[PDB]
Amino acid sequence: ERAIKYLNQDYETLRNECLEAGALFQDPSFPALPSSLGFKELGPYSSKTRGIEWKRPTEICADPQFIIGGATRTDICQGALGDSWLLAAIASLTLNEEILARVVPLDQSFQENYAGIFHFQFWQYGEWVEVVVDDRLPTKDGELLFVHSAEGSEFWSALLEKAYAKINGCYEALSGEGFEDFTGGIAEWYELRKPPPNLFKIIQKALEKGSLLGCSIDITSAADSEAVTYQKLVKGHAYSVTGAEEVESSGSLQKLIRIRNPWGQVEWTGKWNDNCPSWNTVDPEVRANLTERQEDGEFWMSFSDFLRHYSRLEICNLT
Ligand SMILES: [Ca+2]
Ligand SMILES: [Ca+2]
Numbered sequence: 001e002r003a004i005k006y007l008n009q010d011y012e013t014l015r016n017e018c019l020e021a022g023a024l025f026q027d028p029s030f031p032a033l034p035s036s037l038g039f040k041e042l043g044p045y046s047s048k049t050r051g052i053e054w055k056r057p058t059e060i061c062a063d064p065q066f067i068i069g070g071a072t073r074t075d076i077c078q079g080a081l082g083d084s085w086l087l088a089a090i091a092s093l094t095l096n097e098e099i100l101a102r103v104v105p106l107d108q109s110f111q112e113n114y115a116g117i118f119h120f121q122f123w124q125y126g127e128w129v130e131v132v133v134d135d136r137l138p139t140k141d142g143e144l145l146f147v148h149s150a151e152g153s154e155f156w157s158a159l160l161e162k163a164y165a166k167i168n169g170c171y172e173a174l175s176g177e178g179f180e181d182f183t184g185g186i187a188e189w190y191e192l193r194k195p196p197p198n199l200f201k202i203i204q205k206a207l208e209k210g211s212l213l214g215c216s217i218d219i220t221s222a223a224d225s226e227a228v229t230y231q232k233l234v235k236g237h238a239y240s241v242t243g244a245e246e247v248e249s250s251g252s253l254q255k256l257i258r259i260r261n262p263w264g265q266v267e268w269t270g271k272w273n274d275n276c277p278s279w280n281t282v283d284p285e286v287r288a289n290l291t292e293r294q295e296d297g298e299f300w301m302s303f304s305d306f307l308r309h310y311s312r313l314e315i316c317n318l319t
């Protein structure tokens with residue numbers, strides 16, 4: 001099996017051509033120009049594009065790395081772009097070892113055979129499509145403007161997002177509800193107001209099989225977009241559902257669900273948050289395995305609070 005090459009651009013061939021020529025890849029189909037950024041919010045006349053400079057990782061930091069400490073969900077920290085659903089999906093995808101391995105090839109780095117070109121594969125329309133990109137990334141004041149990793153010198157996620165931007169036409173096309181446009185397989189939606197009786201099980205089974213799960217809070221008006229609630233949840237913003245466990249708390253079974261804000265910051269402050277004393281009611285060994293005091297965007301909340309505070313849940317069965 002061989003993935004369909006987007007625009008018939010072959011990674012190996014293009015990389016070798018550049019190496020031989022002693023030059024860095026400059027993608028003719030997706031240039032480091034305003035058109036690749038956007039058309040309105042990120043359009044050529046938008047104040048949001050003010051000061052943007054395209055730079056390869058080598059100009060961003062001293063020792064750029066493709067992957068550091070593995071390609072995981074903590075490497076997904078949203079930038080100045082409204083692509084929370086895409087990022088929630090990518091974060092969820094890192095939990096599926098096999099798929100991630102195909103989406104993010106390891107035959108690339110900033111050390112060996114580096115020529116400023118990288119590639120990724122996307123599950124699209126019942127077919128695998130491979131996309132190449134040069135590594136010039138949008139920056140502002142010396143730092144990545146859009147997605148970035150908690151590790152300042154790690155670039156696989158920044159480059160993956162760019163590849164998504166390329167296949168969709170521009171970064172702005174990644175903005176504006178659902179995994180569908182960025183993933184494959186069939187997507188099933190659930191209204192948390194009227195959940196199936198065995199939803200917790202469904203969630204657990206979906207997680208165990210490697211499906212992608214995301215959830216969000218409906219917004220009243222456009223002004224309510226990204227509004228922060230009393231318990232520090234963000235409205236009209238996609239979150240990845242990354243875990244689900246039923247624990248024994250003070251002698252009672254408690255269904256808990258783990259959620260991750262793709263911002264990589266700003267977490268729920270209700271019961272079961274990282275510093276909640278409720279964790280003292282759980283077996284020390286169990287707690288050690290499930291929670292830690294870290295602002296990484298990931299937190300736990302009871303399934304009950306989840307059902308009460310979130311509006312929708314999407315599950316994308318890759319297989
Ligand atoms: Ca990493
Ligand atoms: Ca956390």
